[PDB]
Design a protein around this ligand. Sequence first.
Ligand SMILES: Nc1ncnc2c1ncn2[C@@H]1O[C@H](C[C@@H](N)CC[C@H](N)C(=O)O)[C@@H](O)[C@H]1O
Length: 258
Amino acid sequence: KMQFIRVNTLKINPEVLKKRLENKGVVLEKTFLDYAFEVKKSPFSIGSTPEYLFGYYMPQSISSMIPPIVLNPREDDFILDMCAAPGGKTTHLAQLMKNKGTIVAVEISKTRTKALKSNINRMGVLNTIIINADMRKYKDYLLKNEIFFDKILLDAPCSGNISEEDIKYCSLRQKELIDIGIDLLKKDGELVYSTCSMEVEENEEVIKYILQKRNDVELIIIKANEFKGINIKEGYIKGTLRVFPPNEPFFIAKLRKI
Ligand SMILES: Nc1ncnc2c1ncn2[C@@H]1O[C@H](C[C@@H](N)CC[C@H](N)C(=O)O)[C@@H](O)[C@H]1O
């Protein structure tokens, strides 16, 4: 299985970090991103370097770096990260926003909220409000108070996080979450649905469900061609993307409230 790291441009320049790690015996390979590297060899556990501890990078699959790139938040945006822990994608969104605007990062589990806050503090992120709550109830609070967002990441839990039952259970949850995400989007706003599963029940089923359920949503077409070097192709709904082995299994789509 491949290992990659995302360089945290909040704190450090790609080439400064690259030189420092290569001088300690790390062998790094380019990526379709100037701030992400493939780790080819490491005398270090990569979550264990002083550089990691300083917030210089985040280890993560390259697949998992796509949803924030596709959502493409701007600097001053107001952003919801619906299912946020451990914060891989929350800190990615913050880096893309350069620590401007606001991310509301929501996490159901109390324990996982710990890991989320740790990642955020470690990566030096300042634009993020951590909510420990069930999104399905937290959204009434947001709706009552008219708190709509410019762009939303729904990076949903997946069957793999933990059978046919696992998949059916996750799919149902994902369908609940996405309807909620559309409800919380400003008119003309953008939601990315992603998940660590390439199973169609968690993928195009959830997309087909929301398109038939609602009249106020439009599929935005995403293209693979940008994502060089990644085993990524079009889903079975045009303009959706599925990532395959030997990349980490993943699915990404993008919607617009009309
Ligand atoms: N209703 C819910 N509200 C908030 N968080 C949830 C809810 N249901 C599941 N989750 C969380 O969804 C997360 C699943 C992860 N795949 C998210 C990864 C995260 N987006 C990252 O990039 O690092 C877990 O943290 C679950 O605790």
